[PDB]
Design a protein around this ligand. Structure first.
Ligand SMILES: [Cu+2]
Ligand SMILES: [Cu+2]
Ligand SMILES: [Cu+2]
Ligand SMILES: [Cu+2]
Ligand SMILES: [Cu+2]
Ligand SMILES: [Cu+2]
Lengths: 333, 333, 333
């Protein structure tokens, strides 16, 4: 049975952190139990006060990252409080059958349901809400996150060597379609339902008004930067459930990258910029060699700097003059 | 000679089916003869009656898939009836020299021409019309399809193991640019030529009005779904001659995928969502493990659910409770 | 030291040519010195007289390609004449640390600075201007080019065999955002600074007005075609610092392609159409087998034929009838 196996509970943590877990494991399959509560709310998504009638898993954008090993069974309890207004569900791209779980988790406000599925394929996978007749709206409103399924003996390079990371960070990139008035000012709506008709008009143009990391412009900049040390190896998980993106680290590289996100395939190395297909999650490894501030962004630079898709990584350590050196500071010709 | 070799004729079949053929073959090179007749017509492309002044190879969108083995010679007779109004030609991406065949097949209404080219490279390749001064228009109006060139000893995995499919289905994804009036209603034109000027204005915005599989919204849904059985392996051929797309199977995966479409390269596995570059055809293999209805779509979900790029696969068989199981149906908290 | 090593100077050449260099080298690391002067100017970017208030490295779009071997140190002297109006800098994606060099090269009009960085990773890399608060504008105005870092023992295939090229050509693809008036005519500005506000409005739509190869519509067509001979192998370097593109050679293929551009990874073969992620440079090898005119373009065909992203290659040699042959010229049915 797929049931009899040990059952364990995981306590989910908010982006950009990832809950504690082991990379390689000497241990057999288990049933990992997770709980997620849906939360509809109006959020401030920029520095000028623009608002979004948003829909979330666990109150954040993106939803939390769930991590298990290849072979485990995922047991998710999805709860939809009576304070919400819309029906919701989940679609795990890492699962097999019934529209990824969506058919078995239709949950109206005040209901809950429990689904179990075998995670028999390795990689980072997107999960998202997908209620019949309104999938694009719930996804674009914030309902997505990642499931990471690690190979039981950890991540490997192309020749089979072991690859380790010291920390993992999870970034969700969201293309947002906030309507504008005649003024040229973004609209504010009193209820979620009221935002609907205008939002679908903007969606159909295919031109986002804002593209943000983790829920807002500047979520991961300045004081909210990601942090690391030179010599530390970081796993950067990047998901985009609806639209393509092309991540890049200014002053760094993707040492080892799975741009399609599936760990059974060999990774590519030394990438300047990688590509995550809308509807998927990818992963990149990097080891910091120089201290200082780094920017992590979508390298359509108008999308990064005008629309919002950019973040910071602040790195501690000692400068290395052999890698890079200013021989002549700026001066008069 | 490349001529002396046996000559054989193939009878072309309409999408989404593919004409009978062998995967591995113990047999030498041959000259495969195919005939295609161009057909200009006005087609209904949605469920609300919107019309398109369309241009086709053999009366369908996409044109039929032609399948040969690596080493064969393709011998195509292109016919352009006197009832059409425009000159046409063909450009095979699988061919070498003279703009892919386009320079040797310029055929005015009432003319025909015969081209022969060696298919010396393995994979799925796009073919499309390409008349000087109006290529984008003929392509966007429906003139494209796929040529599949199989390795003589069939498809293989990365370690060289044999890979087989039970059935093959061919999907053509078309980005359409139908002008709108002041009303906000799509225009209807009496002739093909009359549609031209407005259509090029819409094309230049780069925003399609509709994105459809095989000629219309709902072509492959409900009663027109693709069909399969659990334990059956299907080859899903996907072409897009002008614009990128990112195919995904809800509740399934791409077991083995050639997203750039060329069989001499190793395939990737366990993909949630793959990517077909505009101007190319890719291929994915999957084996059904669970019965039920599956959706096959472009995972920019606004493109799939608002603009039309989505289809269904209806699968017969027995549920497998170990893969997925509802432990607690929806109920009150 | 990284200094003590021999120092050598390279004389930069204009696109589409690449300065003389060796592929494999039996020689150790050196310090290669290069000099680039920034040049702001108004350029004519089409055949109808449209103008662009452009910004360049060395007076061309794209900037010149710099080529070194893996292990060398790049020593760039960046000069910004007193005749320019804006501050500039450089960001090498091939470098590690301080925003790719951008923090150490901030150069106001009338200043110069010298940076040295180790090129420890193999491939074609984009370099671009990136001044704080205005990066998208300087990039989109023309400030980008490629750095090619060759493996010390040359390019290799997947099984390790040596791969050689006879000539290399460098193509920069630029998405341009030239504002339009009420008339429907493109605006002309007296100064660079005056173009700014309108340009950022057009950028935010994400819809280029023009997409060109090397600075203008028709830069590489007709009399300006690239040239080759049958039996010759060409390396086609393609960079796009802001926006995706999907290169294709009509009548040819990418024999061996590094679409993500990094030489330590195995290349893919027999590609009809490849993909360069915005923010990166890729490379493809091809050997001409048939004489005649070839087109090299972005296979979103509206982008290629309406917006400008298309070029020509004129090939000398003898027709090969086995590859392709017209058996029946166009004639009456
Ligand atoms: Cu929902
Ligand atoms: Cu999905
Ligand atoms: Cu045609
Ligand atoms: Cu083509
Ligand atoms: Cu600049
Ligand atoms: Cu950059």
């Amino acid at each position: 049975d797929a049931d009899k196996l040990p059952h364990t509970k995981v306590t989910l943590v908010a982006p950009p952190q990832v809950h504690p877990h082991e990379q390689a494991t000497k241990s057999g399959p288990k049933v990992v139990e997770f709980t997620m509560t849906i939360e509809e709310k109006k959020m401030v998504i920029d520095d000028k006060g623009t608002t979004l009638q948003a829909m979330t898993f666990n109150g954040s954008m993106p939803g939390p990252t769930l991590v298990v090993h290849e072979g485990d069974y995922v047991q998710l309890t999805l709860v939809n409080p009576a304070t919400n207004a819309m029906p919701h569900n989940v679609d795990f791209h890492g699962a097999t059958g019934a529209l990824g779980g969506a058919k078995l988790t239709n949950v109206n406000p005040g209901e809950q349901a429990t689904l179990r599925f075998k995670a028999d394929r390795s990689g980072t996978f997107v999960y998202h809400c997908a209620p019949e007749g309104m999938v694009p709206w719930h996804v674009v409103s914030g309902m997505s996150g990642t499931l990471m399924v690690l190979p039981r003996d950890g991540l490997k390079d192309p020749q089979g060597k072991p690859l380790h990371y010291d920390r993992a960070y999870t970034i969700g990139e969201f293309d947002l379609y906030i309507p504008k008035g005649p003024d040229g000012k973004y609209k504010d709506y009193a209820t979620l339902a009221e935002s609907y008709g205008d939002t679908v008009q903007v969606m159909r143009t295919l031109t986002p008004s804002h593209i943000v990391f983790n829920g807002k412009v500047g979520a991961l900049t300045g004081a909210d930067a990601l942090t690391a040390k030179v010599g530390e190896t970081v796993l950067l998980i990047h998901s985009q459930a609806n639209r393509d993106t092309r991540p890049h680290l200014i002053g760094g590289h993707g040492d080892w990258v799975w741009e399609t996100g599936k760990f059974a395939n060999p990774p590519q190395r030394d990438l300047e910029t990688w590509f995550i297909r809308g509807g998927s999650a990818g992963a990149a490894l990097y080891t910091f060699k120089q201290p200082g501030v780094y920017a992590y962004l979508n390298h359509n630079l108008i999308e990064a700097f005008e629309l919002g898709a950019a973040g910071h990584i602040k790195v501690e350590g000692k400068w290395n003059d052999d890698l890079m050196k200013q021989i002549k500071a700026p001066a008069p010709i």
